[PDB]
From a paper:
The bison NHA2 construct used for structural studies is referred to as NHA2ΔN, because it does not include the first 69 residues of the N-terminal tail. The bison NHA2ΔN sample preparation was subsequently optimized for grid preparation, cryo-EM data acquisition and structural determination at pH 8.0. The final cryo-EM map of NHA2ΔN in detergent was estimated at 3.0 Å (Fourier shell correlation (FSC) = 0.143 criterion), although protomer A was consistently better aligned than protomer B, and was therefore resolved at a higher resolution. Overall, the structure of NHA2ΔN in detergent has a model resolution at 4.2 Å (FSC = 0.5), which is reflected in the fact that some side chains in the core domain and the connecting TM6–TM7 loop could not be modeled, probably due to flexibility. The observed additional N-terminal helix TM –1 is part of the dimer domain in NHA2ΔN and is domain-swapped, mediating homodimerization by interacting with TM8 and the TM8–TM9 loop in the neighboring protomer. As a result of the tilted angle of TM –1 and the length of the connecting loop to TM1, the NHA2ΔN protomers are held apart by ~ 25 Å on the intracellular side. In NHA2ΔN, the dimerization contacts are small, made up solely from interactions between TM −1 in one protomer and TM8 in the other. Although NHA2ΔN homodimerization appears very different to any Na+/H+ exchanger observed so far, the NHA2ΔN monomer has a high degree of structural conservation with the outward-facing monomer of NapA, but with the additional TM −1 helix. Dynamic elastic modeling of the nanodisc NHA2ΔN structure shows that TM −1 is indeed flexible and can spontaneously adopt the position seen in the detergent structure.
Residue numbers in the entry:
A (entry chain A), B (entry chain B): 78 to 293, 300 to 517
């Protein structure tokens, strides 16, 4: 009599090797332990098992253990071991492309899940929260960094823009899960945070690019990117609410690919044209415009996108933590960098609390919004790599040394504020605004 | 208001180009019109539309037009036009690999649909039908060709083996439709023809290889191929009836994928090792062992394999008909080749009729069996291409001319007897054994 315990494993093993051989025939060395495709699958599995372990094995009693910490730790262990990192290697273009795709997935889901009429009721708070804390934190961090490390204003201002950048990837999943359940009456608070933390990305890169050029105009170029992004999103919006009608079938599957596929294509086309970052605004506008014109087909396509986002979630964080090979063990008095990021994070809490004292937020809503700007994600990692690449083209040792310090504080910030911030908002949601 | 008729096409077009752009990013090449992957998709679509046109627009009134004729014409047009020959091209390695995969699909489906206890009731007639008419037809064709074309016995014997060959790639779909429909009482007649005309490929290639070596031992090697195939099939048979059990879930998809993958792996492993054709019998034995196990999910997985076979059927015919550019317009007294082909077909009818006069087949069954061995398939094309490759390595003008003549008659035979034979058996099914 066959045994189910000894038959499930055998069947799965045979299926895996059979599928492995098929891809090996069409690719070759990629499926070999040393290759790109093999590394992506192994990194995907490593991130999956890391998330499961962090939350089901050693989870804390009262606060559930978020999988974000496990994903970053899994990527850190993979890259920071020469024998392990030898087999799994990923090209820079694939890492950048996967980052752009995953970032587009979380943005379109936020726009699709955003509630209408929220902008009309309160738009000033969203604009002030998008511009206010980002500029104040960058200035305060630059001043705090100045006269402490010795680097000039060109490096100080550049570090401030990189350090202050709210990341949609780490906040949107928290808001949508909270919004689906809901505590009390959600008066647009989840929509306010989701929309506000999107325009920040454009300003952060625009300031970073302009400041980088000074260390080597672009201010007007960034404005054109915002204008183009709105126009491109608006044009694509009318072609998703009109061509797909009730006459067509398979509405759930057909239109989910359409909105997601155009979102990915828009970002790559904008980046290839010469003005990156306009795609991030285009997908949000396209998703918001589509929701305006959907025939109550919101939750139908939300489930498909949610599954797609859940797939890319381990993949996105795995790439972020798998690029710390250079500074694996380089003790260079990192305590000073901790103080610089810690003060700026502390200032970030205070300024965000101040900006939400106008109306509506009486007592508890101020605290939740202030703590919702803690986590950081790929946005810092992408610009940080670009700064290193520009530095290591015609720069001498001093420029290389300064660039290394920027990487250390930027990587450390993602290690600290991302899992703690995501964990804090998860447990404080049912404990602050219920 | 949007119009569904004018929007469905637009939605489909946008989806296709968006999906096409995704492949462009993943694959650095093969996406342009000059790529081989683009040609595969075009050939697949051209064969699909060709089959639909031949049978739904200009179909004859009483006899339905089979799609086999349309597939051959569609492939012929693509290759036989100079401006449509260089823009779209397909490499030889992919064509050879796809032929083996398509051949494996029809073999496993034929074995799965085979009726149990059919071999035990009458196996002598199956062996005689497999060996008798095939060898006699090859000998008669060589003698008939001799004293007519002037080629020596080395070329005459090789032509006879290539000309005389029964392939299940065409007859099995006709038999399965007959089995599914049912007329009167089916005493294993469809299964008898499928089983007898399944392992004849091994004998055909063994004779071709033996004759090629003499024209440049193999008999002993061919016997070993049969022995290895039976042993591999027997061992693999117990691994599909035991490991996949009712305890697991999604048996329909899991078992169908498992048998398809193992069949492909066995054929590729045998071909790469140095003895091609052994995997052809191995999948038949493996399917027979799976059929004898009686998993009770035959019809559940037959539909899935039938859909897969229906997908690969235009692809297999498209590759065969896309290698006729060499002999597009070469008038070299082809009437003699037609006469030799007609006599060989006439000889095949007589010998097949003689071998089915033992028992059971009273009047109508003899006619059906004789007409069931007329259609031919890729078996001739594969060996014919090998003969051309061997000829064009150290051969002079006379050998080159002889090799071209062998291809012309072989290509002509496939063009004639395959669609006419398939059409003839299709209309005679409900009119002979009713």
């Amino acid at each position: 009599p066959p045994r189910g315990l000894l038959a499930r494993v055998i069947t799965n093993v045979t299926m895996v090797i059979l599928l492995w051989a098929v891809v090996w025939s069409v690719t070759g060395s990629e499926c070999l332990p040393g290759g790109n495709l093999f590394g992506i699958i192994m990194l995907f599995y490593c991130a999956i098992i890391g998330g499961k372990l962090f939350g089901l094995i050693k989870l804390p009693t009262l606060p559930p253990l978020p999988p974000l910490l496990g994903m970053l730790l899994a990527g850190f262990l993979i890259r920071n071991v020469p024998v392990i990192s030898d087999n799994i290697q990923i090209k820079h273009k694939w890492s950048s492309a996967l980052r752009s795709i995953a970032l587009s997935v979380i943005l379109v889901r936020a726009g699709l899940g955003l509630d209408s009429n929220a902008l009309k009721k309160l738009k000033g708070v969203c604009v002030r929260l998008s511009l206010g804390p980002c500029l104040i934190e960058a200035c305060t961090s630059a001043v705090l960094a100045y006269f402490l490390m010795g680097l000039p204003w060109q490096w100080g201002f550049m570090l401030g823009f990189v350090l202050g950048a709210v990341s949609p990837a780490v906040v949107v999943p928290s808001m949508l899960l909270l919004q689906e359940g809901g505590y009390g009456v959600e008066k647009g608070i989840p929509t306010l945070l989701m929309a506000a933390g999107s325009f920040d990305d454009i300003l952060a890169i625009t300031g970073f690019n302009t400041c980088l050029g000074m260390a080597f105009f672009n201010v007007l170029k960034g404005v054109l990117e915002v204008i183009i992004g709105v126009v491109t999103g608006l044009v694509l919006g009318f072609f998703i609410q009109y061509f797909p009608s009730s006459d067509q079938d398979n509405l759930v599957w057909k239109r989910a690919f359409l909105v997601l596929g155009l979102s990915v294509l828009a970002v790559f086309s904008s980046t290839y044209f010469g003005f990156p970052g306009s795609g991030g605004l285009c997908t949000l506008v396209t998703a918001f415009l589509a929701g305006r014109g959907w025939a109550s087909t919101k939750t139908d396509v939300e489930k498909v996108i949610a599954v797609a986002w859940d797939i890319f979630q381990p993949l996105l964080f795995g790439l972020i933590g798998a690029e710390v090979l250079i500074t694996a063990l380089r003790p260079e008095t990192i305590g000073l960098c901790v103080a610089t990021l810690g003060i700026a994070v502390l200032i970030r809490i205070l300024v965000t609390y101040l900006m939400v004292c106008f109306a509506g937020f009486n007592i508890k809503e101020k605290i939740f919004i202030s703590f919702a700007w803690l986590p950081k994600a790929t946005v810092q990692a992408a610009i940080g790599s670009v700064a290193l690449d520009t530095a290591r083209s015609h720069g001498e040792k001093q420029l290389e040394g300064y660039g290394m310090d920027v990487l250390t504080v930027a990587f450390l910030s993602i290690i600290i504020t991302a899992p703690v911030g995501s964990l804090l908002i998860g447990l404080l949601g049912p404990r602050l605004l219920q």
